[PDB]
Amino acid sequence: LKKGEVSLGTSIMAVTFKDGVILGADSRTTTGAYIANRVTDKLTRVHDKIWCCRSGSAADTQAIADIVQYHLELYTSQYGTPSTETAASVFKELCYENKDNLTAGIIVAGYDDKNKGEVYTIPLGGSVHKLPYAIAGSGSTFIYGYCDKNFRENMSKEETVDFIKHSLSQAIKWDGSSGGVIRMVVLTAAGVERLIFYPDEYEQL
Amino acid sequence: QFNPYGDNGGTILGIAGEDFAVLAGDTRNITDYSINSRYEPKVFDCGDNIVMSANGFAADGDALVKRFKNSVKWYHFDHNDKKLSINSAARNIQHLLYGKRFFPYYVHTIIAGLDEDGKGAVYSFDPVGSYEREQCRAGGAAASLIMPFLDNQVNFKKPLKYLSVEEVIKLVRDSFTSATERHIQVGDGLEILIVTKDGVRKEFYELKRD
Amino acid sequence: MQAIADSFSVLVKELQYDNEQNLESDFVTGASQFQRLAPSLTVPPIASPQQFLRAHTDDRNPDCKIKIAHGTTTLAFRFQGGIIVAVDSRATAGNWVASQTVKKVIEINPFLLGTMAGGAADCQFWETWLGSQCRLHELREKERISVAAASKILSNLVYQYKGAGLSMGTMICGYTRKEGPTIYYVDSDGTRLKGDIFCVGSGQTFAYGVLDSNYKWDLSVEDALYLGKRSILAAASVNLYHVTEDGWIYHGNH
Amino acid sequence: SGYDRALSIFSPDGHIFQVEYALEAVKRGTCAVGVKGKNCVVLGCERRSTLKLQDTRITPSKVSKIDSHVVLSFSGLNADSRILIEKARVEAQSHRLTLEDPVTVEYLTRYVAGVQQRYTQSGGVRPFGVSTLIAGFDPRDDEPKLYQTEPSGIYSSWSAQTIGRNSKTVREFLEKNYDRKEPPATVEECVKLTVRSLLEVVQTGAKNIEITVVKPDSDIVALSSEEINQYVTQIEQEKQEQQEQ
Amino acid sequence: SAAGYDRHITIFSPEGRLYQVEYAFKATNQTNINSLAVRGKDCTVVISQKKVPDKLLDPTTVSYIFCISRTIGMVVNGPIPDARNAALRAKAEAAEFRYKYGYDMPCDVLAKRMANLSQIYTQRAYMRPLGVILTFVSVDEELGPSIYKTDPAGYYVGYKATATGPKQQEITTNLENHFKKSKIDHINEESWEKVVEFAITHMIDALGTEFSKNDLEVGVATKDKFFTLSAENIEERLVAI
Amino acid sequence: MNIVPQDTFKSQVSTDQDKSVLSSAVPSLPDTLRQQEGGAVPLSTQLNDRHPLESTLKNWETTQRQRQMEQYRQIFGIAEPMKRTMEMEIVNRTDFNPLSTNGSIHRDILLNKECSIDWEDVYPGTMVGDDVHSKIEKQLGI
Amino acid sequence: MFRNNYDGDTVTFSPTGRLFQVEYALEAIKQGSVTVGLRSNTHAVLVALKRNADELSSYQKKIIKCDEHMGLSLAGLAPDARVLSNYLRQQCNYSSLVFNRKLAVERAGHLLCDKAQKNTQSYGGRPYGVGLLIIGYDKSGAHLLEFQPSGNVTELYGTAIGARSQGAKTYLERTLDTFIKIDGNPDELIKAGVEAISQSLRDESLTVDNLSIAIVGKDTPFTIYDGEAVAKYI
Amino acid sequence: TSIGTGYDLSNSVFSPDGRNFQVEYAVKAVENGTTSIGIKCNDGVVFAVEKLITSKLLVPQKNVKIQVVDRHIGCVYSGLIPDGRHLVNRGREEAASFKKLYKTPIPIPAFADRLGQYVQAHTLYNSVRPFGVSTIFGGVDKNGAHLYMLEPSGSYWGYKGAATGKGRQSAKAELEKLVDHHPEGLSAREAVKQAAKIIYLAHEDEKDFELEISWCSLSETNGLHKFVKGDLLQEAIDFAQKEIN
Amino acid sequence: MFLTRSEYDRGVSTFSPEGRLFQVEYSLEAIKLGSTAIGIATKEGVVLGVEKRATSPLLESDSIEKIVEIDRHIGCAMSGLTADARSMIEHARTAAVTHNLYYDEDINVESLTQSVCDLALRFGEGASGEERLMSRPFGVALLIAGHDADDGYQLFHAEPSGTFYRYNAKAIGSGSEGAQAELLNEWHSSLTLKEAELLVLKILKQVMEEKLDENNAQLSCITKQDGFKIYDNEKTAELIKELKEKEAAE
């Protein structure tokens, strides 16, 4: 981590459910103790139904995400809609081959008609792990227990929304580098849905 | 910063006789307090009646022995299966060691065989290639225990010339037994390779700690 | 174009054997590693190779330490018809027994001699290499190489690696028809000094004083040998070399 | 036939014709001659008659000093000789720097021949249409050295040699009038022999002749027009006296 | 024909011409099929002729219409190998433009890029031009419906409508007469199906003898997507007037 | 799939590593005069004390190009990188302009840098050498 | 006459669709002397007739050892034989060094085919002009391979290449069932090979100077007999 | 005209009519090769090759004329043997790389496109030669059964039935008849019998021949490429012999 | 059925219809244009002898170097283009010195000959797979005479094709045919050194246009103890006088 750089202190969650996947995050960017950006969209789209969230160095993850989006556009021009596994593999290759020079961590969420919604996590170092749900960031450490106690397979859309909202609200409550609004993207067969929740709503949970 | 070196803690001994040579070593491989293995040979037959040992960092010694054997293979290919003499092997090993002058192998190397007159010959190498022919050379841990034991019973100046192979083997075994008694890194076995005009013969003797 | 196709057609990369140098060093393709007139030296692929080498060369096993040439007194001078080179043969014992006596002076050619006075491996290796270079030059030019040319070759070579870690101080002594008898001193810092009298060792002031007391150009061969032996004895048995136009002659303890 | 279109083709009788064509190009240059004496070397050159409006003070001479003890003359294309001479001078200085010893005459001849040979090893390059005479003395040596180099990279050692236009007549004259058993023992004899050799082809006389003399300890002297005129007049007077009898 | 050189490489003849370029032009009519491109109010339609004389061929694998990006379609006149080569390079160009400049590649910029590559081929001695003609269609977010054509000589230009093939003159004359009659440089219709039907009708009256659903290929570009129609869609368009 | 260039350090050194400038007197040693570098620059000094960003900047564009070729190989096949490399090599090999150092127009078109400027474009930049014949010898391999 | 216009290089087809430089390279094999190879379920042998420049010269080496379990014999050009033998030695060495593995004979044939095909489709070089016979013993038993420099490799029980090799090949075809079952008796197989190569002789007699033999097998490392070592087989 | 003089000595040259004569000469080289056919059935493909008998010295199991590119992809070719081997190796490399990258067997059209681009790249420069082989390949993927034919120009198409080699005309006529007589489709076993019949009929040239057949079907081989055992091959040979006589 | 022109003999990488490379043949023809060199191998050493063709009497006598010292135990004689032989000799000397440097022993004569032939192969693909180094084959032939402990006294012939032979006696150059016939007639395994020298002088005198003397001929020999030496003009003149007396005895 180079001196004077920008780090992605955040709270990232991705949960698979009955009809698809949901990716949620907070909206705070901090330099030290100063909130450099009060309203940030951390949900990065690399393909129509393949989204990601980033951690570590902001510049490195932005460059990696740009390269991944370019790669997936080439793949689509050749073979059509890629699977989430392919995007995860490209992310992993980029993160692992450059790990001695870049600090990047990625959470990838995707949907396709074959695999029906998937979550992959690539922590610092470049290893890849496929999980029914994933949490990352500085504020995730405070919700390792809660999530482990409240996740069920094949939850409905509303139950998944409530679970993500509660978990991210707790992470916001306890982590200094996290705050603002909660953003969520729902990836299903019916399309892409965007959700935003305000502090006056989730702080009362 | 990454440290590319290590230490494995062995003991080797080379002795040149009238018409034979002997290279022996303890067979214990350790990592600084723990026993990795109780039987791991470090003295290797390299062909053309040449025995080699590279004691110290085990990876470097294995690499050096591998490179020397491949070079000998190409030497046989390119020179009508000519026998490689001991002095030529010593020069090859000097070049192999000095090729890593700025990133040296962390080993002490001893080779043994017979010269062109049929007499026993032993060569010792410094880690960056400096080498010389010697009658007797002890290397590694407990060398300071092994050399005085040999000097107490042999006049290198019964004279060493008139000693037989069995007597040399017994003397090496006695010195290694004493060193095993006095040193914590020596033990678990001793392996001796003997080079004569009939070839290379192997002997093994169990030491303390099994 | 087919080579380009091969480059993009899919184990070898991890072994790093797609590089020709790695294949040559491990003797995969042949014994070309032992065919280089200028030897190739491995360097750590990091930002600070010099600091790495210096740190790792000063840290446990006595047998894994780089052997250092004896700092014992070495003397050389030129009287009237050659060069007297004198060393003390008091070898230092260790955990070994020598089959024969060691020599502190390297015999580069039947006409050239050198002294170690530094790192033993550096002196041995590079003076053997210098002997090869001199042999090739003499084959090419059909004439004995001048001592100035040989010393200049050695100095240029050691200067190309200046600061890398080498350590060697040598005295190149020779006798040619055009030059006469000549002595040069070459150091690992690139120094190259021509001289008449050289004394390098632990105690060399005493030997230099004894020489200056009774040095003349009209010395005879026996007188010069006696003076060199006496100077070495004053410094601190004694190996002598007399260099003439026809080569060097070795005296054990004369 | 179809065998003279490249430098990399052998003819069925074992010839490379482009080398012979480069020699043909050399044959059109002005004559050059070199005579080796007992203790000196003399290089003579033929110069085309200077035009009336030509500035005869700054044009390069036909004999160039490679070093303080070696001189070089050429015959053939004048522009290629500049490249060769510059490379020779750079090599002499490089050798002095590398080995602290100035080059020997044979070493410099071999370097020039090596450059000429190296310029015959590609289909995209043109060989030098130049043949050279290299003269001098080895350092701390008193044996005169004279060598000839050819466009193909072949060099030879001579006691007296002529190259260029009408060099066969001069070579026959030298063979008749030069013996290695008794080489000329003084600089004057060598210069007179060189002048008489050049006078067999030179149309006008003393104004189309250039002479350089090399002597040991790096003594290189270019003779003036007046001395060459004196030599020519002496030779003509001797010839007239011989014919009068 | 070329006398000495100019039969292998692209250098000037005594008349100032490049014979290899002209021969590459003549190579574009080998397939002996025609294509037409027209613009609607919010769509662009390309219609190409399918000829499958061989009964052993699989008709679904025969196509000269390619999808380059989300918004750009391409039609190629000429042999199919160079067509596929050009298609792959165009896909790479569009993707690299999007990566490098942060927004989608416009149709005219891609046409200019391909034309510059063709200029390279026309000037370098050891490179040959591709014997194909490329037509790019899209609905640009700034310029609206767009048709741009590029040829082996490196020349590119935009069209209100265009036709290419061995019978391009007849279709061009028919289109010119229609645009004279209507005094509008496009088609005044609100759906791309009507534009497709109009293009089919124009092709039928120009070429003659009509065709079935298996002799035609139709690609349609909207503001969001370029898509190729299937045999059933073409059958519906033929049935619907 | 590299973003920042990697493996930029030398692993071996020798006195004949620069084939272009080698001494004719001693072929195993470099020619100091014809190097024209000040005369007091041993090769060892080039192995230490470099700016960390220099290797990254010197190899940046080659690394991006290699990543693009690798992506083409993964998505398109062997033929696409083969053809790109063949085009670039033909263009580079047919150009020989000893009096200028600027890149050709066709090279810029192939690199997709027709309307792009970097500091290499703005800043493109003796007794012996630097002549046409040295460039001829280096280009032809003689 | 029309062939004279389309045989300049290896990147040119004639109007009839023929690659003449490769055909000429194949024809170059006939200029070499005859070599025979054969094998059984346990051993594989090569027999070679060697030629000398004249009475005062030595005889050419026709059998080259690649590895302790594999070797070959040549018929054709000398430079290409040297190149291919060195390449096979390098491949065997790489296999042994990297994997501690013995290179299979099939793998060696595939590598030779890959290296040979390249020179027949690119400008600037020429096709190889040597035929090779490769014998070896590996985990699948004994193997004999015939390599043709067009880039082709065939696996056979026996074969012969070189000038006037048709008689030896006919003899091997006629007596296949005999030598295919010679297991555990190297001498019988070697004698069968010598008799097979005797069919290709024309005004020539096998001597200790012009006969070379090689054998490989289960317990037999690849061994070459020359001189008096073949006197027992004459 | 089949022979284009002045435009047939270089690979990447256009004729005045816009033709590439070296590619056509490679096509003529293909047309002299051995007959090969491929048939597409309702759920798979069948390949058939007319092998020519050789000496008994050949090891029977080590000389197969149908190459397996991958577990679901099989191919045959007619033309030059080295070119066919090279193209098969390239196809194997492409399939392996695709399976490594995307963790699924490569679809047949993607493989066809990669092979076709590789073939087409060899018609672009004068330093290479067009491939002298025509290839019939195919297999089964998630979308079903695919059969393709690829030509020296890089042109490839999907086929209901494909034929190449000397006996291509008769084989193509028989394939057209088979397609006409079965508008609904065909089964794998009927395809094998008809492939044997067509190979037998196409043969017209004193030389004894054998037959090789290969299957790839979902119902018969679980979507994998297999050879024909003794029983099915013998039955197909009997059917073909009944057809001939 | 018409007479046209064939052009298969102009490129080094072009096959004739029968599979021949005619540029190698033409290089051998270039070899035959050079002067004559004769080598005879016996049990007491190897003798080499060359003819000096001086086009002009002004040429320096001690300037034609057809016999060179590759190493103390290895000498060479050359015939053909001298510029190529210069490079070959430099390569051979480098190989010998490098072998001594890395193995502390003399290199075998056959190993040196093989290295020279591998260099001569460089107009095509190298022995170790190297790229082409030169545009045409060499136009020189070499006679390499040496002694080693493994094989005694050996004489090898090296050709531009990259192939070498071992010979008891061998002649190359312009007058190689008659000289080789004489060597076939007059060589036996029990020759002495002086008899070999006399035979070399006799064959050179037979095959030389000019009258043989100490100035147009040169002799050299290699032996185990004295190494490789080239006889001065006085010794060769004495040998020629002895040969003349022996011839006049009959």
**Burial of I232: CB neighbours in 10 Å, binned 0-12, 13-18, 19+:** exposed
Q: What is the CA radius of gyration of chain G?
A: 18
Q: Give me the count of residues in chain B.
A: 210
Pairing state between β G223-226 and G211-217 = antiparallel
Q: What is the CA radius of gyration of chain B?
A: 17
Question: Hey, what are I88's tokens?
Answer: 């070959």
B95 touches chain I (CB under 8 A): yes
Q: Which residues of chain B does I108 touch, with a Cβ-Cβ cutoff of 8 Å? A: 79-80, 82
Report the residue of B79, B83, B88, B117 to disrupt the I interface, i.e. the one with the largest count of I CBs within 10 Å.
B79
d(C-alpha D109, C-alpha E147), whole Å: 72
Q: What is the CA radius of gyration of chain F?
A: 19
Asked if B2 and B172 count as a contact pair (C-beta separation under 8 A), the reply is: no
Domains, chain G: 4-234 (3.60.20.10)
d(C-alpha D80, C-alpha D130), whole Å: 7
Give the containing element (helix H, strand E) for F86. Answer: helix F79-94
Give φ, ψ of G34 to 5 degrees.
-80, 140
Do chain C and chain B touch with ≥3 beta carbon pairs under 8 Å?
yes
Neighbours of F131 (CB within 10 A): 13
Asked if A131 and A104 count as a contact pair (C-beta separation under 8 A), the reply is: no
Q: How does DSSP classify residue D199?
A: T
Q: Do I93 and C139 touch (CB under 8 A)?
A: yes
Strand ranges (E), F8-47: 12-13
d(C-alpha G95, C-alpha C15), whole Å: 13
Find tokens 């004769």 and name the residue: I38
State how far the alpha carbon of F140 is from the alpha carbons of D8, D119, D125, E124, in Å. 15, 10, 8, 21
Buried b (16+ CB within 10 A) or exposed e, C189-209: ebebeeeeebbbbeebebbbe
Give the containing element (helix H, strand E) for G226. Answer: strand G223-226
Give φ, ψ of H199 to 5 degrees.
-60, -45
What residues contact C125, with CB distance under 8 A and at least 6 apart?
Answer: B94, B98, B129
CATH classification at residue E25: 3.60.20.10
Closest CA to A63 of F76, F64, D21, G173: F64
Facing residue for C37 by CB, picked from I71, I98, I103: I98
D2-241 CATH, one of 3.40.1160.10, 2.60.120.10, 1.10.1450.10, 3.60.20.10:
3.60.20.10
Which of the other chains make 3 or more beta carbon contacts under 8 angstroms with chain F? A, C, D, E, H
Q: How does DSSP classify residue B197?
A: T
Q: Which residues of chain C does B99 touch, with a Cβ-Cβ cutoff of 8 Å? A: 25, 33, 39-42
Taken in order F70, F71, F76, F80, the sign of the CA dihedral is: negative
Q: Which residues of chain C does D141 touch, with a Cβ-Cβ cutoff of 8 Å? A: 178
State how far the alpha carbon of B56 is from the alpha carbons of B144, B148, C58, G131, in Å. 16, 22, 16, 50
Facing residue for H125 by CB, picked from F76, F77, F86: F86
d(C-alpha G120, C-alpha B11), whole Å: 59
Distance from CA of I45 to the nearest CA of G (A): 17
Report the residue of C2, C33, C136 to disrupt the I interface, i.e. the one with the largest count of I CBs within 10 Å.
C136
The amino acid present at I185, given as its one-letter code, is N
d(C-alpha I64, C-alpha D109), whole Å: 15
Distance from CA of E227 to the nearest CA of F (A): 22
Taken in order B150, B153, B158, B163, the sign of the CA dihedral is: negative
Report the residue of I13, I21, I134 to disrupt the G interface, i.e. the one with the largest count of G CBs within 10 Å.
I13
d(C-alpha C50, C-alpha F43), whole Å: 13
Using N-to-C axis directions, what is the helix angle for H230-244 and H188-202, rounded to 10°?
A: 50
Q: Which residues of chain H does A89 touch, with a Cβ-Cβ cutoff of 8 Å? A: 101
d(C-alpha C35, C-alpha C39), whole Å: 9
Q: Do D98 and F142 touch (CB under 8 A)?
A: no
Question: Hey, what are A136's tokens?
Answer: 């990352």
Q: What is the DSSP string of chain E?
A: --SSSSSSS----TTS--HHHHHHHHGGGTT---EEEEE-SS-EEEEEE-----TTB-GGG---EEE-SSS-EEEEES-HHHHHHHHHHHHHHHHHHHHHHSSPPPHHHHHHHHHHHHHHHHH-TT----S-EEEEEEEETTTEEEEEEE-TTS-EEE-SSEEESTTHHHHHHHHHHHHHHH--SS---SSHHHHHHHHHHHHHHHH-S---GGGEEEEEE-SS-EEE--HHHHHHHHH--
State how far the alpha carbon of I65 is from the alpha carbons of D41, G119, I68, I89, I233, in Å. 23, 41, 7, 12, 14
Do chain A and chain H touch with ≥3 beta carbon pairs under 8 Å?
yes
C72-254 CATH, one of 3.30.1300.10, 3.60.20.10, 3.30.1130.10, 1.10.10.10:
3.60.20.10
d(C-alpha B66, C-alpha B71), whole Å: 9
Taken in order I188, I189, I191, I196, the sign of the CA dihedral is: positive
Facing residue for F133 by CB, picked from D83, D91, D114: D83
Residue of I nearest to G124 (CA): I13
Q: Which residues of chain F does H114 touch, with a Cβ-Cβ cutoff of 8 Å? A: 76-79
d(C-alpha E234, C-alpha E219), whole Å: 10
Buried b (16+ CB within 10 A) or exposed e, C7-44: ebeeeeeeeebeeeeebbbbbbbbbebbebbbbbbbbb
3-state secondary structure of F105: helix
The amino acid present at C185, given as its one-letter code, is Y
Neighbours of B167 (CB within 10 A): 15
Domain-wise residue ranges, chain D: 2-241
d(C-alpha D216, C-alpha D141), whole Å: 7
d(C-alpha D3, C-alpha D10), whole Å: 7
d(C-alpha I28, C-alpha I48), whole Å: 21
Asked if C220 and C227 count as a contact pair (C-beta separation under 8 A), the reply is: no
Find tokens 């290895």 and name the residue: I74
Find tokens 């063949």 and name the residue: F86
Which of the other chains make 3 or more beta carbon contacts under 8 angstroms with chain E? A, F, H
Using N-to-C axis directions, what is the helix angle for A58-79 and A84-97, rounded to 10°?
A: 140
Domain-wise residue ranges, chain B: 1-210
The amino acid present at I70, given as its one-letter code, is I
Q: Tell which phi-psi region holds residue A118, choosing left (phi > 0), alpha (psi between -120 and 50) or beta.
A: beta
Resolution in A: 2.3
Q: How was this structure determined?
A: cryo-EM
Q: Is C31 annotated as a binding residue?
A: no
Question: Hey, what are I121's tokens?
Answer: 């192969």
d(C-alpha G98, C-alpha G90), whole Å: 12
**Burial of D147: CB neighbours in 10 Å, binned 0-12, 13-18, 19+:** buried
d(C-alpha E145, C-alpha E136), whole Å: 11
d(C-alpha D25, C-alpha D21), whole Å: 6
Report the residue of H57, H87, H90, H126 to disrupt the G interface, i.e. the one with the largest count of G CBs within 10 Å.
H57
Give φ, ψ of C121 to 5 degrees.
-65, -45
Give the containing element (helix H, strand E) for G213. Answer: strand G211-217
d(C-alpha D90, C-alpha D105), whole Å: 15
Superfamily (CATH H level) for A7-205: Aminohydrolase, N-terminal nucleophile (Ntn) domain (3.60.20.10)
Report the residue of H89, H103, H114 to disrupt the F interface, i.e. the one with the largest count of F CBs within 10 Å.
H114
State how far the alpha carbon of F18 is from the alpha carbons of A156, E9, F32, G165, in Å. 69, 38, 12, 52
Which of the other chains make 3 or more beta carbon contacts under 8 angstroms with chain B? C, G, I
The active-site residue out of C29, C42, C72, C176 is: C72
Distance from CA of I196 to the nearest CA of D (A): 31
d(C-alpha B97, C-alpha C41), whole Å: 10
Facing residue for D10 by CB, picked from I27, I63, I134: I27
d(C-alpha H73, C-alpha E145), whole Å: 43
Closest CA to H8 of E6, E2, I5, G12: G12
d(C-alpha B191, C-alpha B204), whole Å: 5
d(C-alpha E39, C-alpha E186), whole Å: 5
E78 touches chain H (CB under 8 A): no
d(C-alpha B17, C-alpha B113), whole Å: 10
Q: What is the DSSP string of H178-210?
A: HHHH-SS---HHHHHHHHHHHHHHH------EE
d(C-alpha H37, C-alpha H195), whole Å: 7
- What are the residue numbers of the active site of H? 34
Give φ, ψ of H150 to 5 degrees.
-125, 135
3-state secondary structure of C156: helix
Residue of E nearest to H173 (CA): E56
d(C-alpha I102, C-alpha I96), whole Å: 10
3-state secondary structure of F125: coil
Q: How far is CA E66 from the centre of its chain?
A: 10
Asked if I67 and I50 count as a contact pair (C-beta separation under 8 A), the reply is: yes
Facing residue for C67 by CB, picked from B94, B126, B133: B126
**Burial of B208: CB neighbours in 10 Å, binned 0-12, 13-18, 19+:** exposed
Using N-to-C axis directions, what is the helix angle for E80-101 and E107-123, rounded to 10°?
A: 120
Tally of domains within chain E:
1
Residue of B nearest to G86 (CA): B77
Pairing state between β C96-98 and C247-251 = unpaired
Question: Hey, what are B172's tokens?
Answer: 């090496």
Closest CA to F94 of G120, I125, G9, H127: H127
State how far the alpha carbon of I151 is from the alpha carbons of F4, I68, I146, in Å. 59, 22, 10
Q: Do F141 and D122 touch (CB under 8 A)?
A: yes
Closest CA to E77 of E133, E125, E128: E133
Domain of E94, in residue numbers:
4-241
Asked if E20 and E181 count as a contact pair (C-beta separation under 8 A), the reply is: no
Q: Which residues of chain C does B70 touch, with a Cβ-Cβ cutoff of 8 Å? A: 26-28
Facing residue for E120 by CB, picked from F76, F80, F106: F106
What residues contact I62, with CB distance under 8 A and at least 6 apart?
Answer: D157
d(C-alpha I197, C-alpha I215), whole Å: 16
Facing residue for G58 by CB, picked from I126, I161, I165: I165
Question: Hey, what are E114's tokens?
Answer: 């391909």
In degrees, to the nearest 5, what angle opens at C-alpha B194 toward C-alphas B188 and B198? 145
List residues bridging with D46 in a β-sheet.
D209
Give chain I as a 3 state SS string.
CCCCCCCCCCCCCCCCCCCCCHHHHHHHHHHHCCCCEEEEECCCCEEEEEECCCCCCCECHHHCCCEEEEECCEEEEEEECHHHHHHHHHHHHHHHHHHHHHHCCCCCHHHHHHHHHHHHHHHCCCCCCCCCCCCCCCCEEEEEEEEECCCEEEEEEECCCCCEEEECEEEECCCHHHHHHHHHHHCCCCCCHHHHHHHHHHHHHHHCCCCCCCCCEEEEEEECCCEEEECCHHHHHHHHHHHHHHHHHC
Closest CA to E94 of E46, E141, E136: E136
Question: Hey, what are C156's tokens?
Answer: 């240029």
Question: Hey, what are F23's tokens?
Answer: 């001494």
Assign domain B1-210 to its CATH architecture.
4-Layer Sandwich (3.60)
- Greatest distance between any 2 Cα atoms in chain D: 62
The residues on H that touch E, with CB distances below 8 Å, are 6-7, 10, 12-19, 109, 113, 116-117, 119-121, 123-126, 147-148, 153-155, 157-162, 172, 175-176, 179-180
What CATH number belongs to I9-250? 3.60.20.10
d(C-alpha A167, C-alpha A186), whole Å: 17
Q: Which residues of chain B does G93 touch, with a Cβ-Cβ cutoff of 8 Å? A: 70, 73-74
A84 touches chain H (CB under 8 A): no
d(C-alpha D148, C-alpha D132), whole Å: 6
Q: Do G113 and H11 touch (CB under 8 A)?
A: no
Asked if A167 and A146 count as a contact pair (C-beta separation under 8 A), the reply is: yes
Q: How does DSSP classify residue H142?
A: T
Q: What is the DSSP string of C95-112?
A: SEEESS---SEEE-SSS-
d(C-alpha E220, C-alpha E44), whole Å: 6
In degrees, to the nearest 5, what angle opens at C-alpha I65 toward C-alphas I60 and I67? 145
Neighbours of I104 (CB within 10 A): 16
State how far the alpha carbon of A1 is from the alpha carbons of A32, A58, A177, in Å. 14, 11, 17
What residues contact F11, with CB distance under 8 A and at least 6 apart?
Answer: C21, C42, C43, C45
Q: Do I150 and B85 touch (CB under 8 A)?
A: no
The amino acid present at A160, given as its one-letter code, is T
Closest CA to I86 of C35, D8, D109: D109
Q: How does DSSP classify residue G125?
A: S
**Burial of G100: CB neighbours in 10 Å, binned 0-12, 13-18, 19+:** exposed
Q: How far is CA E177 from the centre of its chain?
A: 21
- What are the residue numbers of the active site of A? 10
Asked if B64 and B96 count as a contact pair (C-beta separation under 8 A), the reply is: yes
What residues contact D21, with CB distance under 8 A and at least 6 apart?
Answer: D4
d(C-alpha C183, C-alpha C181), whole Å: 7
Q: Give me the count of residues in chain C.
A: 254
State how far the alpha carbon of H195 is from the alpha carbons of G143, H77, H188, I80, in Å. 34, 16, 10, 66
Say what the alpha-carbon torsion angle D126, D132, D137, D139 is, to the nearest 10 degrees: -10
**Burial of B182: CB neighbours in 10 Å, binned 0-12, 13-18, 19+:** exposed
What residues contact G30, with CB distance under 8 A and at least 6 apart?
Answer: G162, G163, I19
